[PDB]
């Protein structure tokens, strides 16, 4: 009969335990393996009002691997440590958007 | 007359085709029956008195162009019938359903007719509003892209005061679930009025969506006596800054679904629609109208979020028949797939999709059946088929999302959901201590 | 099993429903009955903890009978009592969302038909009822002591609104009272509704000046929207139209209740066609019988509910086709299962509607629809092509003289 | 070059456009064509990274032909397919904002003319179309089997509204059907529109009582605002006016679509004058040909699109002046480049409008506008100053008798 | 008649003058052609039957008072034609454009007519509303005085969902740029509806203008089918607390620009207006209407922010022709400057100015051309002529403002922008590291 | 591929590096050399909502130099150090307003 703790959790794929770097490879790899080309975003506060988070760079497109995405997220979070970073999936063939998941929370 | 069976007729791309599951009387042949379904649909065969020379003959008549028997079955067939575009008012289905199923099924020399499928052209889809938002506008409106959306149908539907109802709204929202719904009798009633239900639901959302940080909502049942009571019931949901409402499109009809669809686009509210009174019409395999028509007669009349049903207890034959209209619910172009039951290649002309709501039991283990079949493009109601959750509605709500957001996460690791779908939930029942008690 | 209580007596504040239920051999009748009462009101999935949270002993639909259909196996009639406190005051889209909403898709039932329904005096008075009952709308037409005369002006389709108003006119000067519209004339690209209301109004006001009596046309308003329905409604009131036609199952009962509250507020009598009716009735094992929808319409409002012709019926079905006629038209009915009226239902003095059937293929079959249907009936002549002598107008005289000679034969004996 | 795809076949859900393109010698025809399709839908400036962001392979206008004009160098016809998913359902102010919006100001093109445009059946049905087609508004006027009779009541300018209603009247009792307003009578300080509608309404209702037929006047509503346009519209409906005049290129197509949705909702037939038309057509190298604007008006609504007189035309241009007549009036056209119709276009059974040209300088040149323009035409008599015998009224009789003698000569042979 | 060429006629200060670039047929003299442009504009020369003695002769007729040939050119001239004030309704341009260009250009004995310039008197300007705000009210409304305003036309105009469109709004706003615009097809469409575009744009502004501390906006394209759809499209932009919207004044016309101008003053929203369908009319140098009329036929009909065009590729001859209507767009009094193309001294009677929007390439180095020519009184769109920015839209937005706010700053040090305009951007590309990659 | 830093920058002439006192002379000198007579304003918070900032003194007019403007801004910021000060240009001949630029930010 355990109660539910008061936790302001996050939008999608966030009730899980925090994502190990092996799993962050695999999530963006399936974002790669649909013939799709991923992207990175960040913000400070995760509001229901705030629908937009700030882009990191241009969306990554080309013939690259999952480790070339984590160079922006994992290896280059040093200038925004106390911010909410996520991976965005901008499914342009169907004008859709796939697999927001928040990464490296303070 | 037998002038309504022209079997050489290639259908125009601007005609309106219909697939009637014709079962005639045993003393009636297949060609006279199919010519009679096409006739009294538009221009009846009562008499021929001095009007065969009058106004319009080759125009303005439904013509049967095809007859094929059903495999393994006799005394019945499927008649394809072509209606010209100029029969109907542009932008309604209350004139679709008065030629094609109006005065059609009550012909005396037919045992049972069923409108299986219907081909709305691009020339007639483009007049319709479509749904007030998309399958993609409301992932964007709600910031919940990447996994199918959820629900908690409040199972004591009758006998709750509006604040106590708004707690059963709140704790199914406070946990994992996104879109808790009014049921089909959760309406205006002496035990809770809708003026007071919408108040106490809107406080349940505002507290839940501000302590869990998402854009959560409630399907507010705005089905009413009149169209003017309904819009007044809908505009009060607008004044509470509500994302979604609920219509019942077969009880209330295909006028007061279109008005609310014209309302919901005009005022930014999403339109969930429940399929009340649908199994009056869909259930018999020889008579009625198949749901695939009424799932395509909602994507034109307007509305997101149609219930599609349990794919849990269905075999591999009726799974594709559900997946026939679900691909006619979420996609833009389909082919002629009769194994999925689709009888016509439907071009939707980029008119927006409709989410595929699915009551999926309470069964936590039946999540990867509902994620491989219904993708990120669906909604999963969790009422009906319910043993309950022995820790409550709110840890029974996280146990229906960690069950989801690990099953969606396992789809994204390159794993599959039919060989090891059950091997993800008990894999996730180690971390979250609330999954292992739901089971 | 708490929903089959056969010792329960039906209160007069209960909304009774008679379901003709057909399960598989393998499901008993008591479980099959107590499942029709379950998922129509309160589901039986939760039994352990949330069964005893709140008042689930008084807000639940319960069975009180199981009566097998004679001669037919696996097919009984489950009378179910629904308490009054479940539904909305003044809406059938909560009645037909409870009673037939999620119950016919129950997995262990292989056919299910709501045969008859009883709305009590406690629940009828929440409704407005019809705009004008028979002895309330025989008064507006100045037409007493004889059944009214409908007509099917159906030069099938493809008429300009003048050409439509040419043929709608010369049956009204022929003697016919009303000349019912197509269902397919809702603003089709050859004649729009703005034009098909105008030249009809130019025909009727030039028809009441030639004959003398008050005549009209059942103008169709079955629109895309209720806004555009009340644009088609209000333009008939602008042209002083007596009656409007409205399809009621395609447009829905919210379209009726929006318009029947409009139609009493503006004096229009609201003719009704039964579009999409044969989807719902006409299967003796499954669906909803028409007498429910001929009673769900008397509460949603709308006069002139279309009834079946007596000519093509057997002697045992003439009771059924007089079953839903005596329901909508008479202010008290009695429980007669031989004609399908499964409940004694007082009508709370509703202004009960007129019972209209088609016909008109023959002129010699008129007193069969006059000795059976009384003075409170519209006789739609199936006269789509023409009448038999010279066209419509010498046949429309022959359609009226073949009734006034028979109504004369009524009062003789 | 991804926008000149000559192997592409035009879908029947594409909105085809035929541009007569004239570059400099120094720009090839393939680059000149693929630049008309570029900046009318999706610009070619971005090629490196943002070319492959999103669906720029299906939301782009593309060329499928280059056909040189015979005899004229540096001047070809670029047929361009625009996909249906780019435009708005029911607006030409998105069609003429894509197709002719930012493309004619392309630097490397020294002249450019949209010759013909094809709106598919998929895109026509999004429009209301005209308020009333010919066989829908021959019915309101009770006028069949003969072309209608317009008139130019232009005592050039400077009339009081009574003095205007004195001259508007005595051509209507003379036999003329409609007596078209000036374009400069929009509330000028010598006669305001409130007064110029009233004494015209006092003239018409006293003209239909003298002759017998239903007559009217093309009342101008081309206002400062759409609010004041629907104050001038609704006061003509208050006075029971059959037809309203509205200039359509000065006021815009949003003024048409506001008023043509008004005009079907209130039964007014919406005459149209072609103000500012010669700014746009009339240059054989540049602009937009009138047949686009005579088809952009059939979708924005409005009857009686003004056409050119046949008398002042060469034999090769009489096909062109019958080219945009057969477009707006007939429900199906065929690809005839000799008369400038560059596309086979089904009209989705639009209620197609009537084709009106001026004339009236001579009374003996009447059957040239009757043997060529059929019964579906208004003949505006240029009769601004007066007619030839005694003034207007003995000339207005001479304007009608010179047609009924010729329509008699039509049915003879 | 040749009574419409009165060459001695001094124009009244309350007449309405017009400069027609007349090119007649080669068998037509200059005096009969100019008398024919003045005639059929108001009172045509068809017949003279018994009306030369009737109502009004010297009143109510357009009269040509001047003929001058064009230097270096033959078979063509410029006819100055005086219209009295009482021909027109006060307060419209849909009656200006029915006498002056209505039924004028289709006279048979004229090869090509072009309305070059038009003299609206003070007696007719004062009835007009003018623009709903000024060139100075909206520096005050937006607190952005001291430098010309900016833009980002979103270059993938076709094929963006409304939230993904609202990111291309957001990052062009998150950087330097002020007024990102809908394009001419960014309207209602199946891929994004305007109800949903305005929502996701208004969240792009609200996040950008609250983390960068300015009053940023978006040009919302409210061009619609009807005037009632347009105001409903405009009033929804009012409900989002939007500063600016967008009209298209030649496609939609000069009624539904005036209503929206009457709307935008009444409801405090600024009115940017794009010049769609303008090069149907402006492009040919012998026929059409010059843009200077339609830039003066917008300052009276109403609207801020007219596009003026690229002054980048123009020579020194057509630079002043652009600067002819731009001084007729922003100033209160001009003179008769035919080197700038202005044919009439225009007194604007202190009716408010219109900002001079200029598409200026993407070219960062083409900023000081657009700051010396167009001062603080202009707007600089940055779409078209675009190689792109290789770091993105948002550092490509600061690289279009540090390029501006150092060029505006170098105007304020006493430096000039034609001798050392390029010497400021690379002077500023040292400090800001985002300029040197745009180049 | 450098990201854009989260900086709440200011209204006009503010994306530059902070203005040296030589440049603050030159900016108000061109505000002088148009035949125009400058002014000074200050405030605490720079909101988009707050359109008004508090005037320092009366606007300076007369035959003065740029150093007689900086006596208020530079030499006399000692009573408002933690406030946002700017120079306003009130172009009264055209009823306009010229060259806001924020000076001495805390």
Swiss-Prot record, chains A, F:
GO terms for molecular function: ribulose-bisphosphate carboxylase activity. InterPro entries: RuBisCO_ssu (IPR024681), RuBisCO_ssu_dom (IPR000894), RuBisCO_ssu_sf (IPR036385). Belongs to the RuBisCO small chain family. It comes from the Bacteria. This is Ribulose bisphosphate carboxylase small subunit. It is found in: Carboxysome. Signal peptide: none annotated. Keywords: Bacterial microcompartment, Calvin cycle, Carbon dioxide fixation, Carboxysome, Photorespiration, Photosynthesis. GO terms for biological process: photorespiration; reductive pentose-phosphate cycle. SMART domains: RuBisCO_small. Disulfide bonds: none annotated. Induction: Part of the rbcL-rbcS operon, transcribed in light and constitutively during growth on fructose. Heterohexadecamer of 8 large and 8 small subunits. Forms complexes of many stoichiometries with Raf1 and RbcL. One of its GO terms (cellular component) is carboxysome. Its main location: other. The gene is cbbS. RuBisCO folding and assembly commences when the nascent large subunit folds with the help of chaperonin GroEL-GroES. Both RbcX and Raf1 help folded RbcL release from the chaperonin and dimerize; dimeric Raf1 binds to RbcL(2) leading to an RbcL8-Raf1(8) complex. RbcS displaces Raf1, resulting in holoenzyme formation. The basic functional RuBisCO is composed of a large chain homodimer in a 'head-to-tail' conformation. In form I RuBisCO this homodimer is arranged in a barrel-like tetramer with the small subunits forming a tetrameric 'cap' on each end of the 'barrel'. RuBisCO catalyzes two reactions: the carboxylation of D-ribulose 1,5-bisphosphate, the primary event in carbon dioxide fixation, as well as the oxidative fragmentation of the pentose substrate in the photorespiration process. Both reactions occur simultaneously and in competition at the same active site. Although the small subunit is not catalytic it is essential for maximal activity.
Swiss-Prot record, chains B, E:
Substrate binds at residues 103, 153, 157, 275, 307, 359. Binds 1 Mg(2+) ion per subunit. GO terms for biological process: photorespiration; reductive pentose-phosphate cycle. Mg(2+) binds at residues 181, 183-184. Its EC number is 4.1.1.39. The record marks 314 as: Transition state stabilizer. GO terms for molecular function: magnesium ion binding; monooxygenase activity; ribulose-bisphosphate carboxylase activity. Gene3D superfamilies: Ribulose bisphosphate carboxylase, large subunit, C-terminal domain, RuBisCO large subunit, N-terminal domain. RuBisCO folding and assembly commences when the nascent large subunit folds with the help of chaperonin GroEL-GroES. Both RbcX and Raf1 help folded RbcL release from the chaperonin and dimerize; dimeric Raf1 binds to RbcL(2) leading to an RbcL8-Raf1(8) complex. RbcS displaces Raf1, resulting in holoenzyme formation. Heterohexadecamer of 8 large chains and 8 small chains; disulfide-linked. The disulfide link is formed within the large subunit homodimers. Forms complexes of many stoichiometries with Raf1 with and without RbcS. RuBisCO interacts with the C-terminus of CcmM. Belongs to the RuBisCO large chain family. Type I subfamily. This is Ribulose bisphosphate carboxylase large chain. It comes from Nostoc sp. (strain PCC 7120 / SAG 25.82 / UTEX 2576).
